[PDB]
Amino acid sequence: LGSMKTERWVVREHVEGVPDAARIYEKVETELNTRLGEEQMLLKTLYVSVDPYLQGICLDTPIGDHMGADSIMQVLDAGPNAPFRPGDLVQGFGGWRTHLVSDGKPKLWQTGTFPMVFPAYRKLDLRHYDDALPLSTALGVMGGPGMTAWGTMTKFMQVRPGDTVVVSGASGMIGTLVGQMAKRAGARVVGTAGSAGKARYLSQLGFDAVIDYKLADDADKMREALREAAPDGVDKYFDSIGGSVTDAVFSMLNVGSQVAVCWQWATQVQRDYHGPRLLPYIMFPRATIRGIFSLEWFTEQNWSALHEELGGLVRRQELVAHETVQDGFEHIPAAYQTLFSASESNRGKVLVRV
Amino acid sequence: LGSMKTERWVVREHVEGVPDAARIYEKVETELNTRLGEEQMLLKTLYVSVDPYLQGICLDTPIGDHMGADSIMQVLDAGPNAPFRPGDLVQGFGGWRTHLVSDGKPKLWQTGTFPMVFPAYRKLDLRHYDDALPLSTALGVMGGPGMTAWGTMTKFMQVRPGDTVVVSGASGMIGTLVGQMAKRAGARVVGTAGSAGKARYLSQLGFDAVIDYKLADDADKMREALREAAPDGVDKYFDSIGGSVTDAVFSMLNVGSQVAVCWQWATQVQRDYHGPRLLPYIMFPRATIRGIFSLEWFTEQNWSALHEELGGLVRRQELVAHETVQDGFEHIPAAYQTLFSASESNRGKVLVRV
Ligand SMILES: NC(=O)c1ccc[n+]([C@@H]2O[C@H](COP(=O)([O-])OP(=O)(O)OC[C@H]3O[C@@H](n4cnc5c(N)ncnc54)[C@H](OP(=O)(O)O)[C@@H]3O)[C@@H](O)[C@H]2O)c1
Ligand SMILES: NC(=O)c1ccc[n+]([C@@H]2O[C@H](COP(=O)([O-])OP(=O)(O)OC[C@H]3O[C@@H](n4cnc5c(N)ncnc54)[C@H](OP(=O)(O)O)[C@@H]3O)[C@@H](O)[C@H]2O)c1
Ligand SMILES: CC[C@@H]1C[C@@H]2C[C@@H]3/C=C/C=C/C(=O)NCCC[C@@H]4NC(=O)/C(=C(O)/C=C/C=C/[C@H](O)[C@H]3[C@@H]2[C@H]1C)C4=O
Numbered sequence: 001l002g003s004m005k006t007e008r009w010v011v012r013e014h015v016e017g018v019p020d021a022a023r024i025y026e027k028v029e030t031e032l033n034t035r036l037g038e039e040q041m042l043l044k045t046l047y048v049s050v051d052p053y054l055q056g057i058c059l060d061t062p063i064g065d066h067m068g069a070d071s072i073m074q075v076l077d078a079g080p081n082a083p084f085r086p087g088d089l090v091q092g093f094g095g096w097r098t099h100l101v102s103d104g105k106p107k108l109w110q111t112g113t114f115p116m117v118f119p120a121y122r123k124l125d126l127r128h129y130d131d132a133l134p135l136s137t138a139l140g141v142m143g144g145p146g147m148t149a150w151g152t153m154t155k156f157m158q159v160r161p162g163d164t165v166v167v168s169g170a171s172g173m174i175g176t177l178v179g180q181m182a183k184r185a186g187a188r189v190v191g192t193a194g195s196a197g198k199a200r201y202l203s204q205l206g207f208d209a210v211i212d213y214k215l216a217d218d219a220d221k222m223r224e225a226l227r228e229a230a231p232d233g234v235d236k237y238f239d240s241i242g243g244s245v246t247d248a249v250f251s252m253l254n255v256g257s258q259v260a261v262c263w264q265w266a267t268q269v270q271r272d273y274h275g276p277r278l279l280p281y282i283m284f285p286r287a288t289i290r291g292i293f294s295l296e297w298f299t300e301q302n303w304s305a306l307h308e309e310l311g312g313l314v315r316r317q318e319l320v321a322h323e324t325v326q327d328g329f330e331h332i333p334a335a336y337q338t339l340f341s342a343s344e345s346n347r348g349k350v351l352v353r354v
Numbered sequence: 355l356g357s358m359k360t361e362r363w364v365v366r367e368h369v370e371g372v373p374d375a376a377r378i379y380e381k382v383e384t385e386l387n388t389r390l391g392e393e394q395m396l397l398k399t400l401y402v403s404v405d406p407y408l409q410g411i412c413l414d415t416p417i418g419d420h421m422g423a424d425s426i427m428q429v430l431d432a433g434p435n436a437p438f439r440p441g442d443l444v445q446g447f448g449g450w451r452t453h454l455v456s457d458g459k460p461k462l463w464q465t466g467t468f469p470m471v472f473p474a475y476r477k478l479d480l481r482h483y484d485d486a487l488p489l490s491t492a493l494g495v496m497g498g499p500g501m502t503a504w505g506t507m508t509k510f511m512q513v514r515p516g517d518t519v520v521v522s523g524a525s526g527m528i529g530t531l532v533g534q535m536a537k538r539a540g541a542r543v544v545g546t547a548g549s550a551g552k553a554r555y556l557s558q559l560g561f562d563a564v565i566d567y568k569l570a571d572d573a574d575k576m577r578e579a580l581r582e583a584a585p586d587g588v589d590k591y592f593d594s595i596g597g598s599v600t601d602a603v604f605s606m607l608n609v610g611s612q613v614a615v616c617w618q619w620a621t622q623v624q625r626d627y628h629g630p631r632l633l634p635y636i637m638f639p640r641a642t643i644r645g646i647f648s649l650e651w652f653t654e655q656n657w658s659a660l661h662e663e664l665g666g667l668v669r670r671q672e673l674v675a676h677e678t679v680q681d682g683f684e685h686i687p688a689a690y691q692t693l694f695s696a697s698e699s700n701r702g703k704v705l706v707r708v
C-alpha cells in the first residue's frame with residue numbers, strides 16, 4: 001500500500017557516565033513500510049520526553065537501534081483489529097522517531113539490565129485537557145512522572161503533620177511534586193538543588209530548606225547541611241540521587257522512617273559504585289526502604305484516580321506542575337543533554353514538541 | 355540496715371572485633387545494699403543470656419560497670435509499692451550479676467550508640483512453662499529471640515507458597531525459627547552455616563539447602579553458591595550477617611521481595627564498613643527492606659500471642675527450639691565465648707543457669 005520517509009535518532013555509540021549526546025546519537029532518515037498488519041497502527045509522534053533514566057536504557061540499546069522514550073503519538077492509520085483508531089491520541093514508549101508502526105501491545109525490553117516490560121499504549125481523551133492541564137501533561141504530571149510521585153505518596157509513604165521530609169534531586173517535576181504533596185500533609189520539606197535560581201524556585205513552591213548539592217559535595221558537608229535543615233531528624237526520604245547525600249540521610253533516620261528509592265544518579269551516572277554499608281543504620285530506627293518502579297501502577301483505575309486527585313489541584317495552580325517544552329525533532333539530543341549539563345534554566349518536566 | 359555479698363562480671367577492657375571474654379571481663383565481689391526504696395526489689399538471678407549483640411553493648415559500657423544481659427530473676431524482697439512480690443519471677447535486662455536491686459521500670463541506655471530504652475521487667479507466669487517449654491525459654495523461644503523471629507514473620511514478612519527464603523546466620527535460634535516458619539508457609543528455605551554438621555542439622559529442621567559461608571568467603575563465591583541453591587531468585591531474606599553474603603543476595607532479588615535486617619555481623623564484629631552500594635539494586639525488584647528492633651513488639655498482647663502461637667508449635671513438636679544451658683555463674687564469659695570461636699556444639703540459644 002506504500003511507504004513514508006521518517007527520521008529517527010539511533011544509538012551510534014555507547015559512552016559511560018554523563019552522556020555526550022552529540023557523540024552518542026545520530027539522526028537518520030528511515031523509509032518505513034506503511035502496509036499494516038491486522039492489529040498494527042501507523043503513528044505520528046507529537047511529543048517525546050527526555051529523562052535521566054534514558055542514560056541506562058541507551059547503554060542497553062544495541063548499536064543502530066532507535067532511542068526508546070516515552071512519547072505522545074497520533075494514530076495515522078490502523079489495521080481492522082487495531083487497539084486504536086485513526087485520529088486517536090495515545091501515550092506509550094514510542095521513542096525518538098518521527099513516525100513508527102506498532103500494535104501497541106506490551107513489549108519485553110529484551111536487552112535490558114532488568115527484564116522490564118513496556119506497557120500497552122494508553123488512549124488519551126482530549127476532553128481531560130485544557131490550557132491549565134494541556135495534552136503534554138500526559139508525559140508529566142498526568143503521565144509517568146506524576147504517577148511516580150503520586151503513587152509513592154499515596155501507596156507507600158504516609159506523611160504526617162510534623163514529619164521532616166527530605167527530597168534528593170528535588171528540582172525536577174517528580175521531586176517538586178513529592179515536596180508539595182508532603183507540605184500539604186503538614187510536613188517540613190527539605191530538598192537539594194543545583195543553583196541559587198532553582199533553590200528560590202523550590203522555596204516559592206513550599207520547600208522549607210534547599211541544600212546546594214554542588215557545594216555540599218561530601219557526606220560530611222551533606223551531614224552538616226542536613227543537621228541545619230532537618231534539626232529533628234529525617235522521617236521520610238524520597239531519594240533520586242544516592243551516593244553521599246543518601247549516606248548522610250541514613251545517619252539521621254528517625255524511628256519509623258520511610259525511604260523511597262526512585263533513582264540513584266550518583267551510581268548510574270557518576271559511577272559511584274562503592275561506599276559505606278547502609279543497612280547497619282536501619283535497625284534501631286526500624287526504617288522501611290522501598291524501591292520504586294512506577295510501571296507497576298500503570299492501571300486504568302490508577303490513571304482515573306491520578307486525574308481525579310491531581311488534576312483539580314493542578315489546574316488551579318495550587319499544586320504546581322511546570323514544563324519546559326523545546327521545539328523541534330532535531331533538538332531532542334540537545335534537550336536531553338541539558339538534564340546533565342545545563343539544567344539551570346529548566347523548570348518542571350522537560351519535553352520536546354515534534 | 356543490711357547488705358549482702360554478690361558477684362558481678364564487670365567490663366575490664368574494651369576490645370573491638372571478636373571478644374576475648376577471659377580478657378574483657380573480670381568477676382568481682384560486690385557488697386549490695388539490701389535496703390529497698392518504696393518500689394524497689396531485691397532480685398536473684400536464675401538464668402542469664404549470652405548473645406552476639408552483647409559485643410556492641412559491652413563496647414558502650416563504661417569500664418568497671420557490670421555487663422548488661424537479658425536475665426530471669428526471682429524477687430527476694432520488695433518495697434511496699436514494688437510491682438512484684440517476693441517469689442515472683444521476672445524477665446528483664448538484669449545483667450551478669452548474682453543479685454541486684456531495681457524498681458523494674460523502663461531504663462534509658464545512657465551510653466548507648468542508640469537511645470535504646472530497656473523495657474520494664476516482665477512478670478513470668480509458671481503456667482506457661484512445662485518440661486517441653488521450660489522456664490528458661492523466657493530467654494529464648496518464649497523471649498526476645500522468639501519474639502524477633504515470630505514478630506518479623508507475622509508483622510512484616512509475608513512468605514507465600516513457592517517463595518524462596520534465604521536466612522543468613524541460620525544456625526542460631528532466631529535463624530532456625532525463621533527458617534522453620536518459612537517452611538511452614540510453603541517456602542523453599544536456604545541457609546548459611548559454619549560446618550558440615552551444622553548444615554546437616556539445618557537440613558534436619560527443614561532447610562532445603564545450606565551454604566558453607568566459611569568456604570564461600572566472598573561475594574563472588576557466595577553469588578555462585580546462591581545461584582545454585584536459589585535458581586529462581588530470592589523472594590525473602592532474613593539477614594543477620596550483612597557483608598558479602600548480603601551483597602550477593604541483593605544481586606538476585608525477585609520482584610516484590612522483602613528483606614528483614616536483624617543484625618549485621620560482618621560490620622559489627624568483622625568491621626566490614628564499606629562495600630558496593632545496595633540501593634541501586636532494589637528499584638526494578640520493588641524490594642522492601644525493613645530494620646528490625648524487636649523491642650517495639652514487647653507488649654502484653656504480643657507475648658500472649660507468642661505463647662499461644664509459637665508455644666503451641668513447639669509443644670506439638672511441629673517446630674524445634676533448642677537451647678544449650680551451661681551451669682554456673684563463673685562460666686558466663688566462657689559460654690559467651692562459644693558464640694564467636696567454638697559454636698559447633700552450640701544448638702540454638704546459649705544461656706547460663708546460675
Ligand atoms: N524509579 C522509577 O520508577 C522512576 C520513574 C520516573 C523517573 N525516575 C527518575 O526519577 C528522577 C527524577 O525525575 P525528574 O523527571 O524529576 O528528573 P530531574 O530530577 O529533573 O533530573 C535531572 C536533574 O537532576 C539534578 N541533579 C543532577 N545531579 C544531581 C545531584 N548530584 N544531586 C542532586 N540533584 C542532581 C539536576 O537538577 P539541578 O538543576 O537542581 O541541578 C537536573 O536538572 C530521575 O532520575 C528519573 O530518571 C524514576
Ligand atoms: N534486631 C533485633 O531486634 C535483634 C534481636 C535479637 C537478636 N539480634 C541479633 O540477631 C542475630 C541472631 O541471633 P541468634 O541468637 O540466632 O544468634 P546466632 O546466630 O547464634 O549468633 C552466633 C552465630 O552466628 C554464626 N555466624 C558467625 N559469623 C557468621 C557469618 N559470617 N555468616 C554466617 N553465620 C555466621 C555462627 O553460626 P555457625 O556456628 O553456623 O558458624 C554462630 O553460631 C544475633 O546477631 C543477635 O545479636 C537482633
Ligand atoms: C511508557 C512508560 C515509560 C517507560 C519508561 C521506562 C522507565 C524505566 C527505565 C529503566 C531503566 C533501566 O532499566 N535502566 C537499567 C538499570 C539502571 C537503573 N536501575 C534501575 O532499577 C532503574 C530504574 O528503576 C529506572 C526506572 C524508571 C522507570 C520509569 O518508570 C519508566 C518509564 C515510563 C514512564 C534504572 O534506571
Ligand SMILES: CC[C@@H]1C[C@@H]2C[C@@H]3/C=C/C=C/C(=O)NCCC[C@@H]4NC(=O)/C(=C(O)/C=C/C=C/[C@H](O)[C@H]3[C@@H]2[C@H]1C)C4=O
Nearest residue numbers: 283284407410411424446447466467468473498622648649
Ligand atoms: C530486656 C529485653 C532485651 C534487651 C536486649 C538489648 C537488645 C538490643 C541491642 C542493642 C545493641 C546496641 O545498641 N549495640 C550498639 C549498636 C550496634 C548494632 N547496631 C544495631 O542497630 C544493633 C541492634 O539493633 C541490636 C538489637 C537487639 C535487640 C534485642 O532484641 C535487645 C535485647 C532484648 C531481648 C546492634 O547491635
